[PDB]
Structure 1
């Protein structure tokens, strides 16, 4: 699915914030826990821990109803800045 040419070398802020949300649910059910499992060790701040991810090994796939599946690995592009 190499229809990935019509995105700026940045994911959008909406997609990035929502993927942070779904990673929140991931690390908030039991554990996909990552590079530091609970090195940041704090009480009930579920969201504010996986915000510090900076690697995010997961894939997200962005579309258009009259278009195909423009896919994107989180790794292969620049971040919120």
Structure 2
């Protein structure tokens, strides 16, 4: 209980030194084609597990085509964490990335 609180304190302070704030983030403002392929694959893997879907599906039964309909209407509730090779990261949302 004393070692864990010291371990938790390090674990979350190390993880706060590695977060880049929303103004200082310098990566690309686009969705880099490997993000679009994993966002659609992760969202559709949630829609297949009865996630609340925010789009009117017109009798589309493919989960992956339903996630491609949320991406087009900017309705996916995900956040991309972009790692830099020293471990630091930038949290870009799916709403503010530019989908090509």
TM-score calculated relative to the size of structure 1: 0.78
Alignment gaps of 5+ in structure 2: 1-18
Larger radius of gyration: 2
Structure 1 segments, 4+ long, off by >3 Å, are none
Structure with larger RCO (C-alpha < 8 A, sep 6+): 1
Deviation of residue 22 (structure 1)?
0.3
Say what the alpha-carbon RMSD is for the aligned residues: 1.8
**In structure 1, how many angstroms separate the alpha carbons of the residues matched to 2:29 and 2:63?**
29
TM-score calculated relative to the size of structure 2: 0.65
- Per the alignment, residue 62 of structure 1 pairs with 82
Deviation of residue 8 (structure 1)?
1.7
Deviation of residue 78 (structure 1)?
0.8
**In structure 2, how many angstroms separate the alpha carbons of the residues matched to 1:22 and 1:78?**
19
**In structure 2, how many angstroms separate the alpha carbons of the residues matched to 1:68 and 1:24?**
28
Alignment gaps of 5+ in structure 1: none
Deviation of residue 18 (structure 1)?
0.6
Q: Deviations over 1:32-80 (max 9, x none)?
A: 21132xx32134x22112211121121110102314111101112211x
